[PDB]
Design a protein around this ligand. Structure first.
Ligand SMILES: COc1ccc2sc3c(c2c1)NC[C@@H](CN)NC3=O
Length: 284
C-alpha cells in the first residue's frame, strides 16, 4: 500500500471504497478498491486474476495485508451511467448501443464459458474508454465476498423469487434491462423494494405462470396470491427499437432461465448483422 498514492475517491463500491491511485513503481494509474480475510475469498479472487478478456476490466493485483484486502484494477475514465446521463437529450446513437451490447455479450460469453457469473450487472459497473470499448467491472466479486442501498432494477426474476442456485442467465437478464435503458433513455424496471421490482416486471411482461415458466409456482418466494397482470407489447416497451432489436431483447427477458438466450447464441442474432465499433463523444 505504501507503493500507492491516492489521487481521488471515485466511488463507494458495495464492498468498500474505490480510489483513483498511482503506482509508485510502475508509474501506473489504477483503480484501487479497499475491501474492509477468509481463505475462501483469497482463492476465488486469485482465480479472477486469470479471467482476462478485452471486455473485462483487468484485475492487475490483489494485495492482502493487515486484515485488509486491496484489489488493484485497470482504470477507465467513465461509466455507462454517466455516459447515459450525458447522452440523455439526444440518446446514444443506435450503432454505438449495438456496439456496446455486442462487446458485453462477448465479455459474458467468455466469463460464462469459464463458469463465472457477474451477478450484479448495472450501468455503474460497465466502464467505457475513448476507443469505443466497454468493459465489465467488479466481475466475480459477488461470489467472492457475498450506507448506500443496493439497486434492484437489473435483478433477474429467479433471484427475486428466492432461487438460491441461479445460473449465467441472470447476467443476460440484467444486460437486457440495460439494453432497453440505453434505447429508451429510461430504466426498464426501476423498483424500490423487492416486491415493487417483481411487480413492475410482472406488469410489463405478465405475471408468470407454469405455462411460460415451468416450476415458477414452487419457487421459495412465489405466492399464489400474486396479482395476475397481462403481458404488454414490446412495441410499447422500447418503441424506437427495430424488430431485430425487439426480438433479441425478448429472448434476453424470457422468464424461464432455461429458455433465456445465452450470450453465445445472442452474438449470432440477426441484430448484429451490421454491427460496427463507433467511437463515443466523451468529455473527461
Ligand atoms: C474507474 O475504473 C474502475 C475500475 C474498477 C472498478 S471496481 C469499482 C469501481 C471501478 C472503477 N468503481 C466504483 C464501483 C462501481 N460499482 N465499485 C467498484 O468496486
Amino acid at each position: 500500500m505504501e507503493n500507492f498514492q491516492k489521487v481521488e475517491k471515485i466511488g463507494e463500491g458495495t464492498y468498500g471504497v474505490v480510489y483513483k491511485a498511482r503506482n509508485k513503481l510502475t508509474g501506473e494509474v489504477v483503480a484501487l478498491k479497499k475491501i474492509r480475510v477468509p481463505s475462501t475469498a483469497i482463492r476465488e479472487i486469485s482465480l479472477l486474476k486469470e479471467l482476462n478478456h478485452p471486455n473485462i476490466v483487468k484485475l492487475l493485483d490483489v494485495i492482502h495485508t493487515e486484515n485488509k484486502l486491496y484489489l488493484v484494477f485497470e482504470f477507465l475514465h467513465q461509466d455507462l451511467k454517466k455516459f447515459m446521463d450525458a447522452s440523455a437529450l439526444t440518446g446514444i446513437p443506435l450503432p454505438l448501443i449495438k456496439s456496446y451490447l455486442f462487446q458485453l455479450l462477448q465479455g459474458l460469453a467468455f466469463c460464462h464459458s469459464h463458469r463465472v457469473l457477474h451477478r450484479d450487472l448495472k450501468p455503474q459497473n460497465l466502464l467505457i474508454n475513448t476507443e469505443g470499448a466497454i468493459k465489465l467491472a467488479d466481475f466475480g466479486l459477488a461470489r467472492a465476498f457475498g450506507h448506500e442501498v443496493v439497486t434492484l432494477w437489473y435483478r433477474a426474476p429467479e433471484i427475486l423469487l428466492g432461487c438460491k442456485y441461479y445460473s449465467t442467465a441472470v447476467d443476460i437478464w440484467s444486460l437486457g434491462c440495460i439494453f432497453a435503458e440505453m434505447v429508451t433513455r429510461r430504466a426498464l424496471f426501476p423498483g424500490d423494494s423487492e416486491i415493487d421490482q417483481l411487480f413492475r416486471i410482472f406488469r410489463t411482461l405478465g405475471t408468470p405462470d407454469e405455462v411460460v415458466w415451468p416450476g415458477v409456482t414452487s419457487m421459495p418466494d412465489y405466492k399464489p396470491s400474486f396479482p395476475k397482470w397481462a403481458r404488454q407489447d414490446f412495441s410499447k416497451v422500447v418503441p424506437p427499437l427495430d424488430e431485430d432489436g425487439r426480438s433479441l431483447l425478448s429472448q434476453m427477458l424470457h422468464y424461464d432461465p432455461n429458455k433465456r438466450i445465452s450470450a453465445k447464441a445472442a452474438l449470432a442474432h440477426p441484430f448484429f448483422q451490421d454491427v460496427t465499433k463507433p467511437v463515443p463523444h466523451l468529455r473527461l
